[PDB]
Design a protein around this ligand. Structure first.
Ligand code: FES
Length: 241
């Protein structure tokens, strides 16, 4: 008997990046409290999640004026930082394409208000299985990540560009970390397409354009995630500063 897409993806990650399985569940039932983008993006629900995360980050600074912009940036770094790595691995090293529509992703949120684990109902994206690596990453961008940035941009407390900036850095970080796995051809192709092309293959704007730039012949982030502005949160080791 042949594996399901869920068992296939799960095997591929156990093979190459076993640690990523801590934050993703494939074709397992989601807990009651878990929510899809549609659910947690509701202004009342999302404002409650961010309130909890605010109290946590400022738990030792109840007098300090709070900066919602670096706060949401960090909340989103959690969300996108936990969701994307296993999806880059699945989409870039699987014959069949996993469907990444946000409605298949039930997010279980940590007690601190940030996301903790993603519970996925796995189905094939038969439209995107014939797609190359570039068009599979464009699909991740268009279907999985744009809705998320738009949900947070709707709070009126952060501009999308900062989130895209941190996402571009993240994606580039894992391409380099996965470079022996993916090969020089696919790495160079994706870097150019994702970071040095103003437009997507479908004409629309590429929101990852110039989120990483060339300085001394190596790819570094162009924009700071601003997490240093939060109390008891450390400046990133590869900050623009
Ligand atoms: S890049 Fe994170 S603090 Fe600057």
């Amino acid at each position: 008997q042949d594996p399901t897409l869920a068992q296939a993806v799960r095997a591929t990650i156990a093979k190459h990046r076993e640690h990523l399985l801590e934050f993703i569940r494939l074709d397992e039932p989601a807990p009651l409290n878990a929510m899809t983008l549609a659910q947690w993006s509701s202004p009342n629900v999302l404002s409650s999640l961010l309130a909890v995360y605010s109290d946590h980050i400022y738990r030792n600074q109840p007098m300090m004026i709070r900066e919602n912009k670096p706060l949401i940036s960090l909340w989103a770094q959690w969300y996108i930082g936990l969701m994307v790595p296993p999806l880059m691995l699945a989409l870039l090293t699987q014959e069949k394409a996993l469907d990444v529509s946000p409605e298949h992703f039930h997010a279980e949120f940590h007690e601190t208000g940030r996301v903790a684990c993603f519970w996925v109902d796995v189905s094939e994206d038969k439209n995107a299985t014939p797609h190359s690596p570039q068009h599979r990453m464009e699909t991740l961008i268009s279907q999985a990540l744009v809705p998320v940035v738009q949900a947070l941009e709707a709070t009126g407390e952060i501009n999308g560009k900062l989130i895209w900036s941190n996402t571009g850095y993240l994606i580039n970080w894992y391409l380099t970390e996965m470079k022996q796995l993916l090969g020089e051809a696919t790495v160079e192709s994706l870097r150019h397409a994702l970071f040095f092309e103003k437009t997507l293959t479908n004409g629309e704007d590429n929101p990852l354009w110039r989120t990483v730039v060339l300085r001394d012949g190596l790819l570094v982030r162009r924009t700071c995630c601003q997490r240093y502005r939060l109390p008891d949160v450390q400046q990133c080791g590869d900050c623009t500063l």
